[PDB]
Design an enzyme around this catalytic site. Structure first.
Site, PDB file in Angstrom:
ATOM      1  N   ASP A  24       0.064   3.035   7.867  1.00 45.12           N
ATOM      2  CA  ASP A  24      -0.967   2.491   7.138  1.00 45.12           C
ATOM      3  C   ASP A  24      -0.240   0.932   6.841  1.00 45.12           C
ATOM      4  O   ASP A  24      -0.084   0.876   5.452  1.00 45.12           O
ATOM      5  CB  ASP A  24      -1.653   3.112   5.998  1.00 45.12           C
ATOM      6  CG  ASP A  24      -3.047   2.891   5.637  1.00 45.12           C
ATOM      7  OD1 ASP A  24      -3.362   1.580   6.307  1.00 45.12           O
ATOM      8  OD2 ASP A  24      -3.403   3.178   4.552  1.00 45.12           O
ATOM      9  N   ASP A  55       0.824  -1.165   0.022  1.00 41.39           N
ATOM     10  CA  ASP A  55       0.231   0.100  -0.188  1.00 41.39           C
ATOM     11  C   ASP A  55       0.938   1.182   0.095  1.00 41.39           C
ATOM     12  O   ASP A  55       0.436   2.345   0.829  1.00 41.39           O
ATOM     13  CB  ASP A  55      -0.816   0.099   1.187  1.00 41.39           C
ATOM     14  CG  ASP A  55      -2.196   0.853   0.861  1.00 41.39           C
ATOM     15  OD1 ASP A  55      -2.423   1.355  -0.022  1.00 41.39           O
ATOM     16  OD2 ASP A  55      -2.810   1.509   1.921  1.00 41.39           O
ATOM     17  N   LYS A  91       2.100   4.744  -1.203  1.00 39.40           N
ATOM     18  CA  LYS A  91       1.475   5.472  -2.004  1.00 39.40           C
ATOM     19  C   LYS A  91       1.681   7.029  -1.116  1.00 39.40           C
ATOM     20  O   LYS A  91       2.014   6.941   0.185  1.00 39.40           O
ATOM     21  CB  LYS A  91      -0.021   5.585  -2.111  1.00 39.40           C
ATOM     22  CG  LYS A  91      -0.900   5.352  -0.992  1.00 39.40           C
ATOM     23  CD  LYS A  91      -2.373   5.111  -1.364  1.00 39.40           C
ATOM     24  CE  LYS A  91      -3.221   5.164  -0.164  1.00 39.40           C
ATOM     25  NZ  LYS A  91      -4.806   5.065  -0.490  1.00 39.40           N
ATOM     26  N   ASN A 110       0.695   7.716   2.352  1.00 43.11           N
ATOM     27  CA  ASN A 110       1.354   6.764   3.380  1.00 43.11           C
ATOM     28  C   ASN A 110       2.800   6.927   3.532  1.00 43.11           C
ATOM     29  O   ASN A 110       3.381   6.208   4.037  1.00 43.11           O
ATOM     30  CB  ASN A 110       0.925   5.332   3.106  1.00 43.11           C
ATOM     31  CG  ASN A 110      -0.275   5.045   3.255  1.00 43.11           C
ATOM     32  OD1 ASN A 110      -1.095   5.445   3.844  1.00 43.11           O
ATOM     33  ND2 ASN A 110      -0.649   3.879   2.410  1.00 43.11           N
ATOM     34  N   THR A 123      -4.752   1.072  -4.050  1.00 39.35           N
ATOM     35  CA  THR A 123      -5.340   2.341  -4.941  1.00 39.35           C
ATOM     36  C   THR A 123      -4.761   1.878  -6.367  1.00 39.35           C
ATOM     37  O   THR A 123      -3.694   1.859  -6.566  1.00 39.35           O
ATOM     38  CB  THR A 123      -4.891   3.817  -4.574  1.00 39.35           C
ATOM     39  OG1 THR A 123      -5.204   4.021  -3.061  1.00 39.35           O
ATOM     40  CG2 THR A 123      -5.259   4.764  -5.227  1.00 39.35           C
TER      41      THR A 123
END
Ligand SMILES: [Ca+2]
Ligand SMILES: [Ca+2]
Ligand SMILES: [Ca+2]
Ligand SMILES: [Ca+2]
Lengths: 145, 316
Positions: free
Chosen positions: B158, B136, B138, B141, B177
């Protein structure tokens, strides 16, 4: 509007809260409104604060500012408040927001931004390329994103 | 997990953000006075997965956070549990996003960009040495511990999608995402640590140009561009970008997972660690595109001015 509400929150609250105590007294709202040509009375400021004052402390906390923003966005037509905002930005009434007017509004709000930032704001708002901000360019800056 | 009440040991304060089924609030430990972030994750524990989080996912996230201890990664301090939520008391990271800090700068060379990217690479390296995939990665984060120092300290947050990569077991899923996922995620293909490198490549692309490589007008176009590895270095956005940076991004955005750069190979790429003074001087003279990056920042400045003016008009 989680992202937009968080952005407007962090920015508008800190712009009002020029001493940084977590609350907004009537004096800060008064100074901001007086830097924008408005002249409200102390009773009117207290009535503004009391309509959202949930914990009854005399000042506006964070979620009270959020609920006031919600009531603002709910009790008026979008186009009309955008028109009034443009009329505030555009002082000479010519129909175009120049760099001087934008800088004057930003500095009245309490922003210490240089001429490069005002230039880049005007350019980002300028679509046709004349160097000024049309009313259509204003609403498209404020339209869906 | 601790079955005791959170409010018995922590004063809960302002809301710092949220996600799907979790909400983070600033807190202060009563016994010590230090400040932390309490992430409340709503327990589900029913077969209907429409509302809530499974206990397996919560336990996996807590185990990952417990196994991880690095200065570039967030650190789990404690975990409590009541009848509704599981509360993860974590290290407080209050410096905002990395991109939000980089945007408000006047000029940014590729050298400082590589310094921040190398902080990110050190975090991902600590994670990958333990065979833990973040899954995750991105800009949302990539936080700062404090924007109160010249070169801020980066933290990775996260870990809701983190997963342990075990040898010889197949792990396939669809998450994250779409703008930042690897082709093996959109194709429902076996996953590994390479998706983190693909996402790092996308993040570097965005940092260097302000544009996204595979982002289309719709989700279908984005997925088609990801699975077809369709991107370009447009001179309108990549006029000043160096050749080493483009080579780095190109070596990170590869479909075949075995040919994609590993984290150690990215650490040894000449753009992050130059070999000679010539390419170091080239990385010094190259300027990142700060205009297409500050685009959205100045747009939100416009919107802030509008909000203040409209609130002042609405009350008179
Ligand atoms: Ca105050
Ligand atoms: Ca209040
Ligand atoms: Ca004018
Ligand atoms: Ca114009």
């Amino acid at each position: 509007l989680t992202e937009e509400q968080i952005a407007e929150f962090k920015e508008a609250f800190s712009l009002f809260d020029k001493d940084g105590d977590g609350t907004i007294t009537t004096k800060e709202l008064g100074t901001v409104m007086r830097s924008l040509g408005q002249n409200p009375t102390e009773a009117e400021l207290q009535d503004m604060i009391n309509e959202v004052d949930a914990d009854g402390n005399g000042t506006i906390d964070f979620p009270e500012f959020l609920t006031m923003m919600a009531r603002k966005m709910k009790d008026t037509d979008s186009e009309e408040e955008i028109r009034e905002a443009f009329r505030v930005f555009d002082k000479d009434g010519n129909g175009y927001i120049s760099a001087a007017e934008l800088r004057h509004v930003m500095t009245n709000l309490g922003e210490k931004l240089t001429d490069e930032e005002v230039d880049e704001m005007i350019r980002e708002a300028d679509i046709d390329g004349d160097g000024q901000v049309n009313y259509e360019e204003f609403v498209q800056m404020m339209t869906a994103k | 997990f601790k079955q005791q009440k959170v409010e018995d040991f922590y004063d809960i304060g302002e809301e710092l953000g949220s996600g799907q089924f979790a909400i983070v609030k600033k807190c202060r430990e009563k016994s010590t006075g230090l400040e932390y972030a309490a992430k409340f994750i709503k327990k589900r524990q029913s077969r209907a997965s429409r509302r809530g989080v499974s206990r397996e996912e919560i336990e996996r996230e807590v185990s990952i956070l417990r196994q991880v201890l690095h200065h570039n990664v967030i650190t789990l301090h404690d975990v409590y549990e009541n009848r509704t939520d599981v509360v993860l008391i974590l290290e407080l990271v209050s410096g905002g996003e990395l991109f939000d800090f980089l945007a408000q700068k006047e000029s940014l060379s590729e050298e400082e960009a590589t310094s921040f990217i190398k902080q990110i690479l050190d975090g991902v390296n600590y994670l990958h040495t333990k065979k833990i995939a973040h899954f995750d990665l991105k800009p949302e984060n990539i936080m700062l511990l404090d924007k109160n120092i010249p070169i801020p300290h980066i933290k990775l947050i996260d870990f809701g999608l983190a997963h342990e990569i075990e040898d010889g077991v197949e792990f396939k899923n669809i998450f994250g995402t779409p703008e930042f996922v690897a082709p093996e995620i959109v194709n429902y293909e076996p996953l590994g640590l390479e998706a983190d490198m693909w996402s790092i490549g996308v993040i570097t692309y965005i940092l260097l140009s302000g544009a996204s490589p595979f982002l289309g007008d719709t989700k279908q176009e984005t997925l088609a561009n990801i699975t077809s590895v369709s991107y370009d270095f447009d001179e309108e956005f990549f006029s000043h970008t160096s050749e080493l940076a483009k080579d780095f991004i190109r070596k990170l955005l590869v479909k075949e997972t075995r040919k994609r750069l590993t984290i150690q190979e990215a650490l040894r790429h000449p753009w992050i660690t130059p070999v000679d003074n010539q390419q170091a001087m080239v990385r010094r003279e190259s300027v990142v595109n700060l205009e297409n990056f500050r685009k959205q920042y100045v747009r939100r400045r416009w919107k802030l001015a509008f909000s203040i003016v409209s609130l002042c008009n609405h009350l008179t």
